[PDB]
Design a protein around this nucleic acid. Structure first.
Lengths: 215, 153, 5, 240
RNA sequence: AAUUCUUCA
RNA sequence: GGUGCAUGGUUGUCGUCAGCUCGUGUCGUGAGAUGUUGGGUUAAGUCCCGCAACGAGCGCAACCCUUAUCGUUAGUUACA
RNA sequence: GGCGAAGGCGAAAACUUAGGCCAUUACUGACGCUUAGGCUUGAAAGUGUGGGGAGCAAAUAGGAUUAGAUACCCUAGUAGUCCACACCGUAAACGAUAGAUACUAGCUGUCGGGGCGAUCCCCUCGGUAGUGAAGUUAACACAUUAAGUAUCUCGCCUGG
RNA sequence: AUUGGGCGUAAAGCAAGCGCAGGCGGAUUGAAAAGUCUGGUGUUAAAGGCAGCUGCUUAACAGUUGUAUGCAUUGGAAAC
């Protein structure tokens, strides 16, 4: 029906979430498939540290990964056994003939990233919590930080079959036709006994038009 | 304030494509001591409609006093072709009325009163009939002022 | 409302 | 006394047989000439009571609103009163929902103040096209808010030039608890206005006399000299 | 001139 | 393998048609109306005017790329 | 616009005949209201008896269009549409509002009477109009010519 | 539908009119007492309905005390 807002601005406002290159198209497919594994690993096995996003910076026979989150604490742990652990699951996907340096950092004012919003909504929905209170608390909390409008909606079975009441909330200013508004998007799946629930979140982090070109 | 709600409807306007399901709510508010009011509102979701109804009910309050805990005369609520008869009750016997009217007259601050509906059973017009029946009454001090007598003898 | 004080 | 009966040389007169008989009590016996003249003692009493009420509301540090919106004349009268003696005024049409709700107008007046302050601070640091657009927006905001930019709360009292032409405004005023006063034409209800002032509204000169007298009523309470202050003489000013 | 459109919500 | 009459995501379509609504307020005992009405110009609920409506959101215009002008930087694997 | 209780009533005149309006210093003295049963009328179609057929046209014929057309279209075409003597007693016989009575804001038209008296202007009495508060009705809407406050009596209504 | 509904559009105003009977009905004055007001007398079986009390291991119940209501007769006043 409607096009995604994140993709349209790739390369004109934002930069690629992964920055890499190789020779002609003979192993670049392997490049994508092998960095996709860690990309989905950081999102699947860690849903308790609220990672904002992952940046893959891997060059010829090297690898660097910058990661941003809000509580890196569970990523590292209190005694650094997790960092050796994370290094190892990085190892079997990257190989045994390359370095494995990496770093995790804190994102300033994390309550503006759509990824943690989607994770919070998924966690709330999966535990059979009233949807109304969930969206209301999430919307009020995110708007408390101070920004433009938020577009959060849910689709799927809500405590019953024959869904005809997918809720949709919108406030502030949400211009999708604007070629750039720094409106980040996230899509997440909440797995409940009533099938899959799709949560879509749009977060607007101010206006940047008529100023600057990249980040 | 106790903020009790009564029967809610399920209404929907019709446009091109499906139907705009947007139900309405009605509510009565009172402090059980003499100040009471009622309101009706509509919205897309339950909490918003409830809050709007509470606001529109609570800003539009009106005053009524308590005579020994009950009404001392009979009133016939007559509005929208819906009569309701109110007859005085003794010092105390227990509240007797219809559910909606039960809430209406309990939240006003009365002990007990004789109540019986007539005609239709539509809650909104029933509440309006209760309102104009309870409001248009007059006090013994009123007749004392307008008649040439100090005290009603 | 003759008075206003 | 204020508005001496001698000054009432040309104050009475009404349209031919368009009247609510509820003004039969506040009028002379029905004249055959279809221009029912008025009773001077009651209008004097009512004007004095309005004088005292305005004195009291001004003493208690209140604000009064002036509305005047006839064809060409009364708007000019209200404009001249406004620029002559300070008073809250509305020169253009009263908008539906202007007294019963304030937030929808509080936002507008605050935006007007903020952008006019910016325009004062804007010394052509922006483009000329955008400056002209902003000036046009300021004119748009001011042409409906000619005088409501200095008061930030509801008005305690106000006058109406014609109750049958501020019907929405007077209805909203009666919805709220604040009293109102007006030049009550003999075609209204003796309940829509708390202080009845019967007078003409299509004859410019009587409206001039009464608007000036009420402006003086609010002015002399401001420690400001006035001209109708128990002055037995009068003035000559005519429409054209 | 100018017609009909199978039950079930 | 079944269940798109359980779905998420995605897509067609009306359709790049221009409409779809909300906060507050007013009128009607009600569903609702009022804004979105009307007069003009545009492709456009774009804008203006008056108007019991005051404001607000999405959508459309806009800001992006490309072609058509020229200047500036650069000179090869063009130019010669 | 008017008249008649209703249906209805519009070329002219002759005779008889119905009711109403305005003012009454005139007269009797409540003889007034309503109406079960009863009696009189009652658009239009129609029947019986005796006449007339100009036009119009149920039924019927043919010609058109349509798959069908025993219909809308056309040309023919009879009863009937008239009068006189009898009957039928039905209609959305509607103002979808029974009759009678007094009271309850206003404003602007048209008509008959009387007064002032050139029509055209004013007042007074009655009917027919339009717009309109209170009041009322479910709203639409009524509203001095009530569907308002009320009184008197008849008939009628109780899910399809 | 006496306390307790309607007949413009939801069922219901007969097509209209003349009207016997019946019902309703202006004001003064006296009388009358038919209704209407009302003192007294007599009666309305018991049980049961109701209000107190006693007893059955206690209510169930049984008993006891009192309890309205209508009607005749008689004496008084005359707003309608």
């Amino acid at each position: 029906q409607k096009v995604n807002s994140n993709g349209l601005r790739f390369g004109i406002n934002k930069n690629w979430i992964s920055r890499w290159t190789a020779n002609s198209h003979a192993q670049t497919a392997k490049w994508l498939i092998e960095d996709e594994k860690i990309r989905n690993l950081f999102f699947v096995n860690y849903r308790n540290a609220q990672v904002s996003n992952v940046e893959i910076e891997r060059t010829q026979a090297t690898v660097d990964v910058f990661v941003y989150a809000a509580q890196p604490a569970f990523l590292i742990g209190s005694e650094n056994k997790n960092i050796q652990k994370i290094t190892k699951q990085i190892k079997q996907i990257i190989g045994r003939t390359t370095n494995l340096d990496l770093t995790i950092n804190e994102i300033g004012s994390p309550m503006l990233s759509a990824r943690i919003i989607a994770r919070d909504l998924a966690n709330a929905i999966e535990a059979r919590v009233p949807l109304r209170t969930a969206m209301r608390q999430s919307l009020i909390k995110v708007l408390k930080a101070g920004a433009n409008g938020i577009k959060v909606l849910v689709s799927g079975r809500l405590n019953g079959a024959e869904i005809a009441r997918d809720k949709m909330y919108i406030e502030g200013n949400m211009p999708l036709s604007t070629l750039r508004a720094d409106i980040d998007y996230a899509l997440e799946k909440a797995q409940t006994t009533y099938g899959v629930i799709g949560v879509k979140v749009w977060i607007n982090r101010g206006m940047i038009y008529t100023k600057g070109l990249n980040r | 304030f106790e903020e009790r709600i009564v029967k809610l409807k399920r209404i929907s306007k019709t446009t091109k494509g499906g139907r705009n399901m947007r139900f309405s709510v009605l509510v009565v508010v009172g402090n059980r001591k003499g100040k009471i009011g009622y309101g009706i509102a509509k919205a897309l979701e339950v909490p918003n409609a409830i809050k709007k109804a509470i606001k529109a009910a609570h800003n539009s309050l009106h005053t009524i006093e308590i005579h020994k805990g009950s009404i001392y005369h009979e009133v016939i609520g007559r509005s929208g072709a819906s009569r309701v008869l109110l007859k005085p009750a003794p010092q105390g016997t227990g509240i007797i009325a219809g559910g909606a009217i039960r809430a209406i007259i309990e939240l006003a601050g009365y002990s007990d009163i004789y109540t019986k509906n007539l005609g239709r059973n539509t809650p909104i017009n029933m509440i309006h009939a209760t309102m104009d029946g309870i409001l248009k009454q007059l006090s013994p001090r009123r007749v004392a002022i307008l008649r040439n007598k100090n005290l009603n003898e | 409302m003759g008075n206003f004080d | 006394s204020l508005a001496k009966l001698g000054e009432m040389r040309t104050h009475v007169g009404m349209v031919k047989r368009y009247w609510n008989p509820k003004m039969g009590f506040f009028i002379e016996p029905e004249r055959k000439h279809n221009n029912d003249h008025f009773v001077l003692e009651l209008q004097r009493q009512s004007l004095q009571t309005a004088y005292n009420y305005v004195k009291e509301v001004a003493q208690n540090n209140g604000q009064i609103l002036f509305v005047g919106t006839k064809n060409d004349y009364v708007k000019k009268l209200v404009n001249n009163i406004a620029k002559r003696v300070d008073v809250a005024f509305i020169t253009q049409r009263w908008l539906g929902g202007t007294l019963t709700n304030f937030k929808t107008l509080s936002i507008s007046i605050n935006k007007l103040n903020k952008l006019v302050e910016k325009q004062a601070e804007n010394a052509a640091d922006l483009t000329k096209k955008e400056n002209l657009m902003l000036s046009r927006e300021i004119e748009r905001l001011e042409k409906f808010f000619g005088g409501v930019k200095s008061l930030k709360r509801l008005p305690n009292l106000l006058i109406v030039d014609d109750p049958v032409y501020e019907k929405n405004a007077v209805a909203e005023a009666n919805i709220l608890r604040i009293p109102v006063v007006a030049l009550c034409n003999t075609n209204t209800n003796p309940e829509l206005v708390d202080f009845i002032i019967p007078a003409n509204n299509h004859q410019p000169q009587s409206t001039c006399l009464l608007m000036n007298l009420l402006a003086d009523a609010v002015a002399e309470a401001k420690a400001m000299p006035t001209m109708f202050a128990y002055k037995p003489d009068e003035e000559i000013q005519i429409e054209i």
